[PDB]
Assembly symmetry: C6
């Protein structure tokens, strides 16, 4: 988790808009509200729970630093 | 489970209708009756048992805390 | 595991409740649960078969059944 | 594996013709030559090692008893 | 693991048997197995490629092996 | 981890251009900036975090030294 956790935490704390892409090709958009080992809480209209096992890639709207 | 459990449990307790989206694009709907480490029981006619490994997202029909 | 899944499958097993088992690729199987363990479900009817749980999305009983408490 | 292991072992010992369906819908056919925790070695003109993670169902050509 | 997979892959590696590796999405990769660990297989050719076992359905040797 | 980690570390230190194929057939291109047990940070027009569980293959643009 030495990369994933600080990365997700940075996006969370700075409230960076992100896109989360799913394995079926669906694009979800919002901000990382929180996360644990297995899931990410993505906010916009409501805060939906996204299982990491379904995610292919997380792409921030702007570059960020760790 | 610091987040998954309390979130699912809040949805369960408040009886909030949800959409559960499967990794193949299928959409399920109902209320969460119960859950464990590996499954979610989704009610609305007969209950159905949904394997977490097949779920992409759980989306509440209204915001919760 | 787990605390909900096993008694639910065992209830379908013991009561011979006919079920639909949907696979991750959209295939629907139908029969009765004859047996199961941690990783597989043995499904019987027209033909008997072993189903890996990793390929299953949902199990839907033909009628309501008692849920685990 | 209380059920999986004796079931695969019986198909093996009794040379039962089986059909193996993969998660992508491909059907493989033959007989179980051997297996371990993660893979099945399938035979019949073409020997191949199949990863259990890609298998949806194993369907024998006649019922087995355990 | 394990008791079948490892000697099977190791035999293919030592004997430099050309193999076909089918991915879960139906793509076929070809080459010779250069190396492997618990999670990946390195498939040697022009450039080698690192293949994640979780993406593999079957390994199919070009010739019967033992 | 004996093969995977030094292989990615080589790609990373040497900044080798790579293609990353996802299990759904999508091809990503760039360079490996960093990685851990579960994710790879892929640098292109902007960095993106890719879960290893969604990756099928990693193919360098030129031959590299193997572990
Ligand atoms: N996490 C998600 C969200 C949506 N979708 C796909 O996108 C479609 C539509 O999603 P959405 O934009 O949320 O509109 P819906 O009102 O859910 O459309 P419908 O319920 O009629 O399917 C769904 O059927 C589903 O196939 C998906 O696969 N995964
Ligand atoms: N401590 C952990 C555990 C897992 N994960 C992420 O969550 C995914 C695993 O989620 P899970 O739902 O538990 O896995 P499965 O869907 O069962 O995948 P598999 O069958 O390959 O085990 C991993 O790929 C990893 O990306 C993580 O970030 N940190
Ligand atoms: N958990 C589920 C539910 C259904 N489906 C897919 O959605 C299709 C139709 O949904 P549904 O009406 O719930 O099932 P069926 O009774 O088979 O549909 P129909 O009677 O319209 O053929 C099914 O064929 C199945 O491929 C799925 O993949 N996973
Ligand atoms: N566990 C299963 C069972 C079936 N199917 C798909 O369902 C299709 C047709 O089902 P069925 O007729 O039962 O199997 P077939 O192989 O088509 O039998 P046959 O061609 O001899 O009629 C198969 O091609 C297979 O891809 C699947 O993907 N997973
Ligand atoms: N384990 C397997 C076996 C086959 N297939 C798919 O089935 C297709 C056709 O099967 P096959 O006749 O074996 O095609 P080839 O791979 O081209 O076989 P060959 O060139 O040796 O004739 C393959 O291309 C592949 O997409 C697959 O997805 N996974
Ligand atoms: N490990 C791989 C390699 C290929 N593909 C699929 O196969 C398609 C094309 O095959 P190929 O021609 O070999 O890939 P290209 O992207 O066109 O690269 P190149 O032609 O230079 O090999 C890709 O779009 C990709 O969807 C895949 O999913 N997994
Ligand atoms: N004790 C267990 C272990 C796994 N399982 C189920 O089996 C799935 C994992 O099976 P598997 O080991 O075949 O997974 P893959 O990594 O092969 O996809 C989990 O997602 C659970 O649904 C279970 O129900 N109880
Ligand atoms: N601690 C856990 C264990 C499993 N799970 C769910 O159950 C599934 C178990 O699959 P594995 O056996 O491969 O771990 C995961 O894919 C995940 O959806 C979870 O969400 N939290
Ligand atoms: N202890 C175990 C773990 C996995 N398995 C099998 O191996 C596959 C699981 O692969 P995962 O390694 O990715 O855990 C499944 O087909 C499962 O039935 C097993 O048969 N015994
Ligand atoms: N010890 C291990 C662990 C995993 N594996 C293979 O790797 C798969 C899981 O890899 P992932 O961690 O990438 O999901 C298993 O299903 C199995 O095919 C193995 O062959 N030996
Ligand atoms: N030791 C480890 C642990 C995880 N992994 C990667 O992280 C992913 C974790 O998902 P799973 O737990 O579902 O296997 C694996 O699919 C694999 O690609 C790895 O490559 N080596
Ligand atoms: Cl019910
Ligand atoms: Cl191909
Ligand atoms: Mg599950
Ligand atoms: Mg699993
Ligand atoms: Mg897991
Ligand atoms: Mg696994
Ligand atoms: Mg796996
Ligand atoms: Mg694994
Ligand atoms: Mg690593
Ligand atoms: Mg995986
Ligand atoms: Na598992
Ligand atoms: Na009942
Ligand atoms: Na798929």
């Amino acid at each position: 988790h030495s990369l994933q956790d600080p990365y997700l935490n940075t996006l969370r704390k700075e409230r960076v808009p992100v896109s989360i892409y799913l394995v079926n090709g669906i694009k979800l958009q919002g901000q990382i509200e929180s996360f644990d080992q297995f899931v990410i809480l993505l906010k916009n209209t409501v805060s939906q729970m996204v299982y990491k096992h379904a995610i292919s890639t997380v792409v921030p709207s702007r570059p960020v630093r760790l």
